[PDB]
Amino acid sequence: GPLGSGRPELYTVVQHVKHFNDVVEFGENQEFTDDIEYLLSGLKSTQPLNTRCLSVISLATKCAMPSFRMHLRAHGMVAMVFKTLDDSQHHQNLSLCTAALMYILSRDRLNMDLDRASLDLMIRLLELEQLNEKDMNKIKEKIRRLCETVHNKHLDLENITTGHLAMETLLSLTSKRAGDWFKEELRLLGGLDHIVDKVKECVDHLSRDEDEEKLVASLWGAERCLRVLESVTVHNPENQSYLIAYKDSQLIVSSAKALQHCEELIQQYNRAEDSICLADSKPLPHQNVTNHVGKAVEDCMRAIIGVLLNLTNDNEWGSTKTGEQDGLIGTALNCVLQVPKYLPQEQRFDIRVLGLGLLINLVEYSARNRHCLVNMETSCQVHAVQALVQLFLERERAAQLAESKTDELIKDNKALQHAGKHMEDCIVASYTALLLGCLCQESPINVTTVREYLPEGDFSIMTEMLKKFLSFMNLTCAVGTTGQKSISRVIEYLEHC
């Protein structure tokens, strides 16, 4: 039962005490009961705003002390502290302080301490959108140092904002460390409804034409929220299901549109270093504007696909509903074949894997997604399978050469990079082979096609690659038995082609 404990639970408790980190006192240090009633009064609406902000920071500063937090929570003051701050959303300065306070507090498990109201507050602070500067920076710097100390989290001062700290709070509340309590509560009490609605607002603003500031705010507004939605769906089928159902699949509908806008926007803000943009209208690759918007577009993309992966991984209504969105399957394919050439070299690996992974999810069981993909057409115009075989072969060479360059250096650390690029080109070739193999085993017709565009019609170039890939996967330990087994089966199948 709930009172019962296994060895792991007790081992943690005992290890937590013996080798410290938490140097705590259970004793009613009444100095706390003093400090605390003095601070609580500084938080009230009846107080000038700057006095409140400083009272919050001072309270957050004391909360870097595990013993203080413990006494704050043991007296049941947390819900009360945040009730007093429940008007924070109406003031941007106090909103930053309030978000910072709960982030620090969320180092611990707040199952018993946060109430619905305080949870709704933090969601409001996450939805928030936008004179006393030189000591707001001193406050921001103070917050940054607290974040490092309490969470081992290093943030740039440019990221000590309300949107960031509210996001980090919601990620911290729904991490592995936190458990599942708040993943559950965010759903059951309407929290996820509001985060999705916010994603829709932001994504609808990309569809219009807007200036740098408004564009970055739209994108960052979506990402911020998408990352919380990604978090709450990790190992949580309920939340995946809820987000697929909510408002006629609003999240997926908005996500698909967003991904498409992003595909277009990213061309507009090229940061590729091996590129030469013709247009004088397009920002140069080294401008502040370009690395500010372009990075914002990329980050939003990674967030969109992350959510879509979680919704389509095991859930087939998710895959069905996601595949039905006009142009998504096409956009996903473009994320692999086209988008990367408008990104810094370092970022191309991640996007290719994500796009390929999403395609695999969509195509695994959905016949109609399968059909839509094989009949798709793309650039280098050609059919999808043909393009995917090309990507494989292209990347399979890029790899065996990138290893030659680094096999030369070891004898005759530019090799490190060349080795890193070797691995990357292999994994991309691998996922491409895995996708093609998937399409093949679901229909022999596709086998004929891949054979046509395969040198000699010899599938061994794919199967040999997948064997090494499966072996590499078990080095990462990222995939479990079923995953490993089904990859093996794909190798078997292709081996008989």
Rounded distance between C-alpha atoms, residue 232 and residue 478, angstroms: 20
The CATH label, of 3.40.50.1370, 1.25.10.10, 3.30.300.130, 3.40.50.300, for the domain at 1-497 is 1.25.10.10
Residues whose CB falls within 8 Å of the CB of residue 269, separated by 6 or more in sequence, listed in order: 282, 283, 289, 290, 293, 294, 297, 342
Rounded distance between C-alpha atoms, residue 274 and residue 342, angstroms: 9
Closest among 48, 144, 106 to 228, alpha carbons compared: 106
Residues whose CB falls within 8 Å of the CB of residue 174, separated by 6 or more in sequence, listed in order: 182, 183, 186, 228, 231, 232
Rounded distance between C-alpha atoms, residue 447 and residue 350, angstroms: 28
- Name the β-bridge partners of 382: 378
C-beta separation of 452 from 393 below 8 A: no
Rounded distance between C-alpha atoms, residue 445 and residue 281, angstroms: 46
Rounded distance between C-alpha atoms, residue 462 and residue 400, angstroms: 14
SS3 state at 288: helix
Separation in Å, CA 247 to CA 43, 210, 330: 38, 27, 24
SS3 state at 378: strand
342: its two tokens? 């408008």
Q: Give the number of other Cβ atoms within 10 Å of residue 199's Cβ.
A: 26
C-beta separation of 178 from 106 below 8 A: yes
200: its two tokens? 């829709």
Rounded distance between C-alpha atoms, residue 484 and residue 24, angstroms: 45
Give the method of determination.
X-ray
As a residue count, the chain comes to: 497
Closest among 388, 386, 326, 389 to 355, alpha carbons compared: 388
Closest among 413, 263, 400, 250 to 332, alpha carbons compared: 263
C-beta separation of 387 from 357 below 8 A: no
C-beta separation of 350 from 427 below 8 A: no
Rounded distance between C-alpha atoms, residue 72 and residue 82, angstroms: 12
Report resolution in angstroms. 2.6
SS3 state at 377: strand
C-beta separation of 388 from 432 below 8 A: yes
Q: Which of the 8 DSSP states describes residue 383?
A: E
219: its two tokens? 């994108």
C-beta separation of 349 from 428 below 8 A: yes
Side chain identity at residue 96, one-letter code:
L
The end-to-end CA distance of the chain, in Å, is: 54
Residue bearing tokens 């085993």: 441
Torsion, CA 447, CA 450, CA 456, CA 458, rounded to 10: -60
Element spanning 382, H or E:
strand 382-383
- Using DSSP, how many helices (H) and how many strands (E) does the chain show? 23, 2
Side chain identity at residue 32, one-letter code:
F
Q: Which of the 8 DSSP states describes residue 182?
A: H
Residue bearing tokens 């006629």: 248
C-beta separation of 323 from 250 below 8 A: no
Closest among 64, 50, 59 to 82, alpha carbons compared: 59
Residues whose CB falls within 8 Å of the CB of residue 275, separated by 6 or more in sequence, listed in order: 285, 341, 342
